[PDB]
From a paper:
We performed 3D variability analysis using the 3.8 Å-resolution consensus map of RhoG/DOCK5/ELMO1/Rac1. Five classes of sufficient quality were obtained with resolutions ranging from 4.2 to 4.5 Å and subjected to atomic model building and refinement. The resulting structures of classes 1 to 5 differed from one another in dimeric molecular dimensions. Structural differences were due to the conformational changes between the armadillo repeat domain and DHR-2 in DOCK5, accompanied by a shift in the PH domain of ELMO1. Consistent with this theory, our cryo-EM single particle analysis reveals that the DOCK5/ELMO1CTD/Rac1 core region is highly flexible and can, therefore, readily transition to a flatter conformation.
The dedicator of cytokinesis (DOCK)/engulfment and cell motility (ELMO) complex serves as a guanine nucleotide exchange factor (GEF) for the GTPase Rac. RhoG, another GTPase, activates the ELMO-DOCK-Rac pathway during engulfment and migration.
Residue numbers in the entry:
A (entry chain E): 819 to 1368
B (entry chain E): 1 to 269
C (entry chain D): 530 to 727
Write the structure that this text describes.
Amino acid sequence: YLPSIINDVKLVFDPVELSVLFCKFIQSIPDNQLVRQKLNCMTKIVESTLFRQSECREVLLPLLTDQLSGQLDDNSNKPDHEASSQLLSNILEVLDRKDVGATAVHIQLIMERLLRRINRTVIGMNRQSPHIGSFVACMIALLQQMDDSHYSHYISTFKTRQDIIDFLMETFIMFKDLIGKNVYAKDWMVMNMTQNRVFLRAINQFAEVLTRFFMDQASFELQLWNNYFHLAVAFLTHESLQLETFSQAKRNKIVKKYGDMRKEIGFRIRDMWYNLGPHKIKFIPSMVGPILEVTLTPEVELRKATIPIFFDMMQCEFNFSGNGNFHMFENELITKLDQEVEGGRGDEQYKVLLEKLLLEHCRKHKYLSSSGEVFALLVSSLLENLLDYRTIIMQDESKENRMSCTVNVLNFYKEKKREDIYIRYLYKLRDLHRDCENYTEAAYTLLLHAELLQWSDKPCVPHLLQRDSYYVYTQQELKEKLYQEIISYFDKGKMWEKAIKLSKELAETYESKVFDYEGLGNLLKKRASFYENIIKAMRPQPEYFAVGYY
Amino acid sequence: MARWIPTKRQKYGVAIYNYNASQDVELSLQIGDTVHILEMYEGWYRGYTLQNKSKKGIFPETYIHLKEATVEDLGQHETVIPGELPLVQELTSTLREWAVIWRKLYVNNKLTLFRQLQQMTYSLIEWRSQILSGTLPKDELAELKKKVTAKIDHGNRMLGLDLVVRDDNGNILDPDETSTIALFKAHEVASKRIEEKIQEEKSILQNLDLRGQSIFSTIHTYGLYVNFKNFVCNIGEDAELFMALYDPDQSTFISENYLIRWGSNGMPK
Amino acid sequence: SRPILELKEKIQPEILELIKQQRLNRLVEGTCFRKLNARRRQDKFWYCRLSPNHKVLHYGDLEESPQGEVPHDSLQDKLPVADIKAVVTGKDCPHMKEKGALKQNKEVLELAFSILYDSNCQLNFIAPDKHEYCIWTDGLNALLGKDMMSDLTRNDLDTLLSMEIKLRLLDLENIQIPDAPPPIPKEPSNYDFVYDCN
């Protein structure tokens, strides 16, 4: 109730004397009494009598900051979470008010006494279920209200560079954990857009700080760009054309109110990458892939701006081509490109545009650009292959055509000899055939996989080390597992001749390389069963037809 | 045909009926074809239509229902009442999306929500018509604004659509990035309305007492209407009828006695 | 509403094709249809699923499935959509005229429909009620490429046409459509647009 008096008391009393008297009252409270109550009290303070600020704001706040900073981390912040959120929200709300009074300098004071605090808080206040959204709203409001001058004033000019580096990396990984795992119900489109705009602002500011204190200027400790581009791309990985399209105004509404944020995201990242300069090569292979998907964005303009970066990075290798060429780059390019395209992302115009830009760039340049030209022709062939594959897949929805086209791409990769993706679609086909219960064909495909292996011990490449389970798996052991599986398939495939055939080499391997006679016994048991099956029962013959397509 | 002049005082390019297709860029221009004309001829107007915002159409001045007004009705003072017209345009766009989802619905077995959509659609369109005129009192304006906002937000809900804020004055002020925290408060209030309506779907669409409780908690004064029809009593003399509210448990009356004079002829005196 | 009615029924076909496409969807999702005289351990319920391509019908003596259509190769996965003479409805079904063991009672007079194929084979089936009977006949006639025969179909036509048109008269609000259309102002013969095109 004491705050209830403050209005008319000020109406008949000094402003600042009132301010200091209430401050003295409050600070006199022992540190462990009625904390929520004092928070409500200071709220009932701030919402009023702060419409005028010049004489009180600067003196009222310091105490308020003291309480909230004690509320930062005392291991007992659990009850006052929502109350502190209320305090922070209301004070920032009042601050953003225009008529109330100039506060940009006071904004700076709040920034300096609040920013690391609240960031640390929401870092610790990390669970999605609680009223996290309130804190997030508070801090994004803070970001919106601040200024680039503010941003760079002290937060960019901290103590030892190590501390500011830690702060920056914490902030970046946090933004990643926010964009990923969004905090709202996905219906608060206004909120998401506002959050995106303020995050644009913040990440821009932290881009200039990276440039001005972490270029070759900081000749060392130049890793964080990995996190930075990761965060940027993840932010660049939503809010796309179709979502913009649902209502015809949706494109229009968003663009008029926000524009294509993705456009400036892409251009900022493009110029930043250009700014990397000499560090580009030390930075290419990890982030090759992270560029395709943004290049794969369904727009036109930033795509036009973005494919040229591919020539830029192959050229960066061309500088580094003293040891070989961009083979490491293009391998990753092929692989990634495969995953995203088969994910159902690209377009034909995309492939045309890629060919145009890369050819144009390579004309100006040397022999290695001719190699890039022929490999771009290769890439275009790959792209058209995948596009035909996907259009048939989502067009016909008949497993037959699916198998046909996946065999086509399998043969294409075998022609291109890129073995790993070949294995990937081989396993895809195995899944398909099992779905069809075509045990024999699944067995054959899985055999083609197994055929690549050897009875040696050293696992030569992790390419054969697939995604099903990933640990040592000596080629010997994996080959054993595959042979067991194929034997089972043939067994239920009712084709025991091949079963016995493979059983023979498997027994050979057991008895001459691993000497596990238990395996011998089980395998021979199965082989005897096979011979019994051959001799005893009978099997129908499948009719064979000729099909002439014309 | 010649002499076209760029202007933005012809936003409301309004037809009369299905236009003739005499122009290579004109067709049976539908009744509801508001067209963003870019160029003025004295007798003709050519520019973007609502149906195609990338194609022109030369449409007669006599056929055009000329309206110098633009999307903003305060610069030229076109509002029948300021602060209400934004609501009608937004609800018209809402009706457009209702039509789209409508096409999307019959093809599916969602006929229950489809029919409830029909009835909310009737309610919304009749409210649209009745608020086209500013004849209603200001309290009526506020009440319509509130209830139609609730209805449209609900419609966005079960259709899985985004939300809006700024209950009054066209629902646009807060989405004008005026603040951030108050925006969060508005969004949270919108979610409050949403949770109200999701819990009350099963409360009104099924039950009829929870709505009464919610309505009667908001007000305090009530009046019981009694409409006497005829008195049947074998008296033969003049009768006085003292009907009033009574508390049998408390053995006392609740309302003051209302007196009726009844004649001896079977009819009230 | 004379200009209104002219403009309304004159732009008809969109609702028509939408209705028929929905009917095709309904046939595709289908249901477990009803046979003739499936009393003694004969599966009265059995699905007849139209191809997503809408060229073949997956149907046959399927089991008593209360969930309805099951996706697999039915007893016969073909019904030749290219040669069906017609479907007989009501008394025209010979099995209604059956006076022996397959006497379909007078309570299935409106539930009788038989597909005419092979010029000698018929598919004498029953509907669970009138509305889906008319719906299936609608879908078949859509395959036949002719008009619809559901009262609910006319209901849908009128209601949705009214909805669409009622949405269109918003631009002409407070304005009227002269039932005699306004005279066309004369267009100058020259096409020399002084200002640029587009």
